[PDB]
Design a protein around this motif. Structure first.
Motif, PDB file in Angstrom:
ATOM      1  N   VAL B  20       0.839  -1.081  -0.023  1.00 17.31           N
ATOM      2  CA  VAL B  20      -0.020   0.001   0.016  1.00 17.31           C
ATOM      3  C   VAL B  20       0.948   1.100  -0.016  1.00 17.31           C
ATOM      4  O   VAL B  20       1.956   1.296   0.147  1.00 17.31           O
ATOM      5  CB  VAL B  20      -0.939  -0.015   1.325  1.00 17.31           C
ATOM      6  CG1 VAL B  20      -1.640  -0.957   1.350  1.00 17.31           C
ATOM      7  CG2 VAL B  20      -0.063   0.358   2.529  1.00 17.31           C
ATOM      8  N   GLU B  34      -3.558   4.760  -0.951  1.00 20.24           N
ATOM      9  CA  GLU B  34      -4.067   3.545  -1.745  1.00 20.24           C
ATOM     10  C   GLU B  34      -3.277   2.213  -1.637  1.00 20.24           C
ATOM     11  O   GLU B  34      -2.256   2.432  -1.675  1.00 20.24           O
ATOM     12  CB  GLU B  34      -4.362   4.216  -3.328  1.00 20.24           C
ATOM     13  CG  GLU B  34      -2.961   4.389  -4.075  1.00 20.24           C
ATOM     14  CD  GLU B  34      -3.166   5.196  -5.326  1.00 20.24           C
ATOM     15  OE1 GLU B  34      -4.366   5.438  -5.939  1.00 20.24           O
ATOM     16  OE2 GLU B  34      -2.332   5.353  -6.118  1.00 20.24           O
ATOM     17  N   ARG B  35      -4.045   1.105  -1.926  1.00 19.94           N
ATOM     18  CA  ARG B  35      -3.296   0.121  -2.316  1.00 19.94           C
ATOM     19  C   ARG B  35      -2.924  -0.124  -3.656  1.00 19.94           C
ATOM     20  O   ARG B  35      -3.620   0.468  -4.185  1.00 19.94           O
ATOM     21  CB  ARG B  35      -4.003  -1.251  -1.695  1.00 19.94           C
ATOM     22  CG  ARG B  35      -5.221  -1.640  -2.422  1.00 19.94           C
ATOM     23  CD  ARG B  35      -5.981  -2.975  -1.801  1.00 19.94           C
ATOM     24  NE  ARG B  35      -5.000  -4.021  -2.517  1.00 19.94           N
ATOM     25  CZ  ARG B  35      -5.083  -5.282  -2.001  1.00 19.94           C
ATOM     26  NH1 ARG B  35      -6.281  -5.758  -1.142  1.00 19.94           N
ATOM     27  NH2 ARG B  35      -4.402  -6.254  -2.423  1.00 19.94           N
ATOM     28  N   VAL B  36      -1.902  -0.955  -4.000  1.00 22.73           N
ATOM     29  CA  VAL B  36      -1.197  -0.786  -5.292  1.00 22.73           C
ATOM     30  C   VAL B  36      -0.922  -2.118  -5.792  1.00 22.73           C
ATOM     31  O   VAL B  36      -0.426  -2.200  -6.896  1.00 22.73           O
ATOM     32  CB  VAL B  36      -0.074   0.151  -5.112  1.00 22.73           C
ATOM     33  CG1 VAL B  36       1.139  -0.210  -4.438  1.00 22.73           C
ATOM     34  CG2 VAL B  36       0.442   0.480  -6.503  1.00 22.73           C
ATOM     35  N   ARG B  56       1.218   3.250 -10.843  1.00 23.21           N
ATOM     36  CA  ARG B  56       0.791   4.100  -9.632  1.00 23.21           C
ATOM     37  C   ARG B  56       1.856   4.160  -8.792  1.00 23.21           C
ATOM     38  O   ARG B  56       2.224   5.030  -8.134  1.00 23.21           O
ATOM     39  CB  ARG B  56      -0.285   3.458  -8.847  1.00 23.21           C
ATOM     40  CG  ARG B  56      -1.865   3.270  -9.907  1.00 23.21           C
ATOM     41  CD  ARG B  56      -2.228   4.533 -10.360  1.00 23.21           C
ATOM     42  NE  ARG B  56      -2.532   5.368  -8.896  1.00 23.21           N
ATOM     43  CZ  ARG B  56      -2.626   6.755  -9.001  1.00 23.21           C
ATOM     44  NH1 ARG B  56      -2.226   7.475 -10.170  1.00 23.21           N
ATOM     45  NH2 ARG B  56      -2.887   7.406  -7.830  1.00 23.21           N
ATOM     46  N   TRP B  60       3.624   7.845  -7.555  1.00 24.35           N
ATOM     47  CA  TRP B  60       3.902   8.049  -6.100  1.00 24.35           C
ATOM     48  C   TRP B  60       5.381   8.387  -5.984  1.00 24.35           C
ATOM     49  O   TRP B  60       5.582   9.366  -4.975  1.00 24.35           O
ATOM     50  CB  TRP B  60       3.322   7.049  -4.933  1.00 24.35           C
ATOM     51  CG  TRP B  60       2.042   7.130  -4.942  1.00 24.35           C
ATOM     52  CD1 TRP B  60       1.111   6.381  -5.678  1.00 24.35           C
ATOM     53  CD2 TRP B  60       1.065   8.051  -4.268  1.00 24.35           C
ATOM     54  NE1 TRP B  60      -0.376   6.592  -5.174  1.00 24.35           N
ATOM     55  CE2 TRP B  60      -0.144   7.871  -4.566  1.00 24.35           C
ATOM     56  CE3 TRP B  60       1.489   9.332  -3.676  1.00 24.35           C
ATOM     57  CZ2 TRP B  60      -1.185   8.698  -4.082  1.00 24.35           C
ATOM     58  CZ3 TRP B  60       0.335  10.019  -3.125  1.00 24.35           C
ATOM     59  CH2 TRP B  60      -0.801   9.735  -3.416  1.00 24.35           C
TER      60      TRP B  60
END
Lengths: 85, 82, 205, 80
Positions: B20, B34-36, B56, B60
RNA sequence: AAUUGAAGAGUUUGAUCAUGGCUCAGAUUGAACGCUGGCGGCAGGCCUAACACAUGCAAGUCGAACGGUAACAGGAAGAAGCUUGCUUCUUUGCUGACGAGUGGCGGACGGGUGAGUAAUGUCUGGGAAACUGCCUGAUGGAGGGGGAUAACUACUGGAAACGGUAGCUAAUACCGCAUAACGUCGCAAGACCAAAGAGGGGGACCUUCGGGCCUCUUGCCAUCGGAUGUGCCCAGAUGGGAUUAGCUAGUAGGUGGGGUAACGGCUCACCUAGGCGACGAUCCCUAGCUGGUCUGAGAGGAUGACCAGCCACACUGGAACUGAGACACGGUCCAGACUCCUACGGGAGGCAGCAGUGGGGAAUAUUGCACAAUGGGCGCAAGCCUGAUGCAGCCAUGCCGCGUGUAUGAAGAAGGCCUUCGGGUUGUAAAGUACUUUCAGCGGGGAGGAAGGGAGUAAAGUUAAUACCUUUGCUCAUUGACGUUACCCGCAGAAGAAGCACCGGCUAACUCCGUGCCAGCAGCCGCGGUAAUACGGAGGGUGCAAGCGUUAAUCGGAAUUACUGGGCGUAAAGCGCACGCAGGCGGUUUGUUAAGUCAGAUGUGAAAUCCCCGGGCUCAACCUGGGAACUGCAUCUGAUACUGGCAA
């Protein structure tokens, strides 16, 4: 209580003393300014404002007044002198 | 600091880690942005064991997020495909 | 957790052969079937509506050797599955591993098949399954291990497999002693006399 | 555009401000009947043009006093 | 593919039908109690005294910021037993390191509890007047000085806690000075504002021959962005009471001053006389809120243990200080209650962190192991710390799985119980006979959670440099608390492994004996006053099963608060009758609007949970991938039949 909280106690006391002195000098210079505005003196109050400006900007930069407050002071006081002059 | 890190969610003696993006000062299994992806260290020897959304993650890390040692190891495992 | 008692007593309260002692001989001949399930067994019951529903559920559990919490869970799973809840419930009872070992003729009864399953004598798909209630999927191969192959029991059991009706949804083959559960049994492919609407209505009150 | 509301002036007498009743028309959660329901708001107006009994549009702004986070845009329908 | 979803019965009567209450059958639980108890997996475990706490741990880290050396191990030099070749002792921070101290960062996270709070909270949706350490991007700066102060030394006060006085020293501690913007103020002109170094390595040059100098890494400062976090505002929603109807003077608004990071009665002076309230203010009782959980066909009803989000609290009452952030659980100050030390002068403490005690209670656990994993703090890193966390211990507290054998066996044995003394039943039950070894017991084998980290190379990048550093490959030893692990194989033998409730009706399952309105049973109807299927025992049976009953609590049944989904002539229920305000509803036609309504789109509705289709644990419980769902709200785009607004 037995830790590195003793060190934070003594450091926070030392910094309390330092900050109290600098905060007190800053407040006395601002009292010079709008205590010169109490009488109808334009250039005396402008001299006091020029005397307080570097110290209030400086105490803003050093980290004990949080510069927006710095701005407010000078803003308010500028208004006072162009309410007067 | 925001951190892309693992968060332990399986049963006892059978961990399933979900990777996450959390504010780093939250708890491990707590609040995340967010979980990724996920990471199952067992899963079986079948197909995946781990999938992990690289777009993603790159977003980040573009924002300023840090990455723990396991998530860096997993990105070094799933490099682009394998 | 399982019954462990007089079996033919259970077959005698229900009034019907529950196949609980299939074994060596033919039709019972020493049961006094129908006559006396206890001391006052000569009395006709004049059974209620709850009694017929209950007694149908007990017939089915006492056939397949299942206790109540496990049976009740089968009813919940048969209820949530799409289709006909009676037929789904019999499909869940027929996919049990001890049942599939009984149907293939590896055990004489379902308790003997349950001991073959229990004593690690049975593999499914080349993996040993120790569990009586493993749910055998279609197109699976369930067989006997090399230990407990050519033991007397299973041979004798295959000997009495030919006396029964050879279920359509299996590949019984006794040469290699391996079987293939091919498809789920249709409702019309099993037993014809159990009334599963009675146990649907029993659990739905 | 901006989100605004419409309502009527319920009282007038305050020093460069006004108070406006809003009529939202909401279904009852249990009973399924559409019921009128008010929302009185302390609304700011510079130079207090709207009187009592008007109808006025109104938008949300920064706080201007205690409650008072609302300011008019357009006075309509003043008819006495 | 994701809603396949709904049961009644007993009791008013001589009987009936209706109304109507009471009660039962189901599911559930952080449960307790009684009887019994084999194994495992996964979960759960102070609901009461937010009562008082013994003892041990729960927050430290960095010498790559600084003076330094209290130890430990080396190095150099001296002296000695001198085995002239190894020991002993001493001066030196010289080195790897490091007690104490300054300093940086963290102690605001993690972890606990639910007291208070009925709306300064929470949920959902909007917003503007904001701050943001660490992390990231960009643009630039990082020049030149000063005074100190710990530690240390010397006295000295005090029983201790803790101080005092006088000197010495450093820094990334502190302070000026210079410098100055796309920064602050100002309409501009202008005015003003900062900083800190350290480490690795090195060819030449200069060395006061310590190091300058070059390069790399890292740190500092300023400004603008980003991300995260937080502060603030609005609307709607989120208990009960009208046997609580008036409440409010910083109160409501305005102007100006002050204040805050920021709007704001936030604060003050003055002016206005408002504001809230039957759409329920104010007062009173209760209460953490939510995702959710339980029940339900559903709509609802109850609830909010574990898990996760938010808030509040940290012995009690208050306050601020430091800081990016606190008005701070293991910080400061004051006061109070309690407990403790005392030399009687004064001091000390705060388990609602983890274990654990005493008490309270029907009731709830070990003063365990480890940082191996995941995460956090510090650090360049190695690593140190981590009662978070991983695991283990105790407990049938729950859910799920497995076991207590299997087949055969009629002399239908004996014995028990009944008997119309013919027999029946216990009962293929047991014994006999033949097989099997799950799990427990014993002995071997043995995954996986282990990725990283360390030490050498090779290449590339950088560079003056083939150093140093970074990245990528390669090689070499290694890193598991659980743990005699999961699991696999072998051994011996059915060998170690079944209770609990009930049997009058509801409600599955019947006789005998004892008792005789007693003893007693009971959820309701009601049994018991001599042949009791209701009491107590026995035989027999029924239901569940390592559980089973009782009790407490919730929903259901209960259409007995009826929105879905009830009633009111006589069963309870039409105001004694009217007038009428607020409210609710409103004939008919056309036009416009589009608020309700409908359709689509977008943003959101956290994750887990429920549901569906799959996957992994031998299966299941459990874990998990994807979807559906979250029935909502907001905005935009349309439709205009109905309702509403407006005009006729």
């Amino acid at each position: 209580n037995i830790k590195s909280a003793k060190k934070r106690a003594i450091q926070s006391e030392k910094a309390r003393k330092h900050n109290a002195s600098r905060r007190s000098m800053m407040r006395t210079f601002i009292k010079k300014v709008y205590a010169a505005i109490e009488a109808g003196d334009k250039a005396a109050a402008q001299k006091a404002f020029n005397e307080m400006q570097p110290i209030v900007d400086r105490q803003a930069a050093k980290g004990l007044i949080h510069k927006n407050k710095a701005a407010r002071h000078k803003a308010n006081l500028t208004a006072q002198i162009n309410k007067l002059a | 600091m925001v951190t892309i890190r693992l968060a332990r969610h399986g049963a006892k003696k059978r961990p399933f880690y979900q990777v996450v993006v959390a504010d780093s000062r939250n708890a491990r299994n707590g609040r995340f942005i967010e979980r990724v992806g996920f990471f199952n260290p067992i899963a079986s020897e079948k197909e995946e064991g781990t999938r992990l959304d690289l777009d993603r993650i790159a977003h980040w890390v573009g924002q300023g997020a840090t990455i723990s040692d396991r998530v860096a190891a997993l990105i070094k495992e799933v490099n682009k495909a394998a | 957790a399982r019954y462990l008692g007089p079996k033919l007593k259970l077959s005698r309260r229900e009034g019907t052969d529950l196949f609980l002692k299939s074994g060596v001989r033919a039709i019972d001949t020493k049961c006094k079937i129908e006559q006396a399930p206890g001391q006052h067994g000569a009395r006709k019951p004049r059974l209620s509506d709850y009694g017929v529903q209950l007694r149908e559920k007990q017939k089915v559990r006492r056939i397949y050797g299942v206790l109540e919490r496990q049976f009740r869970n089968y009813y919940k799973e048969a209820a949530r599955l799409k289709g006909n809840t009676g037929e789904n419930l019999l499909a869940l009872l027929e996919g049990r591993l001890d049942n599939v070992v009984y149907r293939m003729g590896f055990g004489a009864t379902r308790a003997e098949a349950r001991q073959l399953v229990s004593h690690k004598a049975i593999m499914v798909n080349g993996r040993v399954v120790n569990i009586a209630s493993y749910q055998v999927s279609p197109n699976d191969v369930v067989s006997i291990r090399e230990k407990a192959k050519k033991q007397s029991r299973v041979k004798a059991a295959l000997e009495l497999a030919e006396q029964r009706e050879k279920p359509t949804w299996l590949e019984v083959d006794a040469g290699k002693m391996e079987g293939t559960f091919k498809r789920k049994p249709e409702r019309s492919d099993l037993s014809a006399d159990i009334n599963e609407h009675l146990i649907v209505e029993l659990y739905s009150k | 555009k901006i989100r605004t509301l419409q309502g009527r002036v319920v009282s007038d007498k305050m020093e460069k401000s006004i108070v406006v009743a809003i009529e939202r028309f909401v279904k009852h959660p249990i009973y399924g009947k559409f019921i009128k329901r008010t929302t009185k708001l302390h609304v700011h107006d510079e130079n207090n043009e709207c009187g009592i009994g008007d109808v006025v549009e109104i938008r949300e702004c920064r706080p201007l006093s205690k409650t008072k986070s609302w300011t008019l845009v357009r006075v309509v329908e003043k008819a006495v």
